[PDB]
RNA sequence: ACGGAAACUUAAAACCGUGUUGCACUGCAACCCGGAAUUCUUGCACGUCG
């Protein structure tokens, strides 16, 4: 299988955490594809989301940023071997990213850090922009404060999928005319431009050769989770949200509250990953993506 | 089936009101309308008497 590089040109965007006014420059890969299952109903027929409902054979990372030429991988959860001052022991924890080569040299406290906390404001701004709300009746309007991220003039997000060629060529079917992204896109808000270009070798998936470093929120079986986690370096999420969808027109109700792992995180052991579905009450199903794929 | 899907940073309010380009100032001081030209040169109160 060949894998996919996707460079956007992603100016602003709005992927929220929690809320409206906060923002995240990550996404999880069950918000991008939920997107999938929601931006192919207005391309489709109901028959290519069908196609997709609970197949999980096509491996896809999340959308990370990229500052210039290199992809910013994120920072791993792995033990750091801090020998040096406590100032750099702190700064790890406010550096989210690295580029492509310096994980290796990361892991045992032998590299710099105020090179890529140096290359975090060359990422781009967390910006906010105030608006105001309803005329709710008659009465006087309010406003609604809303925050998003601005990427920097040279930046957007990344993205490396791989898995059957045919529901891979659906996926750049659909994504050579997905609209705005992000949470808030009827604005201007998450619009970009996809492109394709040939992906870095060095980023292969490893899933057994003793790097066990993912790039995707992602979960295991239930049972296989005891297998995972002797040696798991990992954070819990949430990754809940609204459902109140077209053939679900009632009230909106919620996702099923599920926890998936980190995304840079490293394990004990490799693991598999499928496709969790977070319907709780109502019609159509609704599910989280959890099918990772692994790196150098 | 994206912590999504909807929403105006909006409605009114005069950079206005009091205020002279005004007050003192000769178009004034000095000078002749002044100097040389004959009302003149020709010229009889008379011719005329049985």
Redesign the pocket.
């Known amino acids: 299988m060949n894998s996919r590089l996707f460079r956007f040109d992603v100016v602003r965007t709005?992927?929220?955490?929690?809320?409206?006014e906060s923002?995240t420059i990550g996404?999880?890969a069950?918000?991008?594809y939920?997107?999938?299952?929601?931006?192919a109903?207005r391309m489709g027929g109901?028959q290519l989301?069908d196609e997709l409902v609970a197949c999980s054979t096509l491996r896809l990372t999340d959308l990370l940023p990229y500052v210039g030429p290199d992809y910013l991988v994120p920072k791993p959860l792995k033990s750091v071997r801090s020998d040096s001052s406590s100032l750099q022991k702190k700064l790890a924890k406010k550096i989210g990213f690295l580029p492509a080569a310096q994980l290796g040299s990361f892991l045992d406290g032998t590299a710099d850090l105020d090179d890529l906390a140096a290359r975090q404001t060359k990422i781009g701004v967390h910006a906010v922009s105030?608006?105001?709300?309803?005329?709710?009746g008659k009465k006087?309007?309010?406003?609604?404060?809303?925050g998003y991220f601005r990427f920097e003039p040279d930046a957007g997000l990344w993205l490396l999928a791989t898995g059957s060629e045919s529901e891979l060529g659906l996926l750049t079917r659909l994504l050579k005319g997905?609209?705005?992204?992000?949470?808030?896109?009827?604005?201007g808000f998450?619009a970009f431009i996809p492109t394709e270009s040939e992906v870095p070798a060095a980023l292969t998936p490893t899933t057994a050769a003793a790097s066990l470093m993912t790039l995707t929120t992602s979960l295991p079986t239930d049972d296989e989770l005891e297998q995972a986690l002797a040696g798991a370096t990992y954070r819990l999420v949430?990754?809940?949200?609204?459902?109140?969808?077209?053939?679900?027109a009632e009230t909106?109700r919620?996702?099923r509250d599920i926890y998936k792992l980190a995304a840079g995180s490293v394990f004990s052991r490799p693991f598999q990953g499928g496709i969790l579905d977070v319907?709780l009450g109502?019609?159509?199903?609704?599910?989280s993506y959890a099918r990772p794929l692994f790196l150098a």
Do not use: M
């Open positions: 709005h992927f929220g955490d929690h809320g409206l923002s996404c999880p069950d918000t991008l939920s997107a999938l299952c929601v931006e109903l109901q989301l105030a608006k105001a709300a309803i005329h709710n006087d309007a309010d406003p609604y404060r809303v997905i609209s705005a992204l992000g949470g808030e896109r009827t604005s998450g949430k990754r809940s949200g609204f459902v109140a969808s077209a053939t679900y909106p919620r996702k319907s109502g019609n159509h199903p609704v599910y």
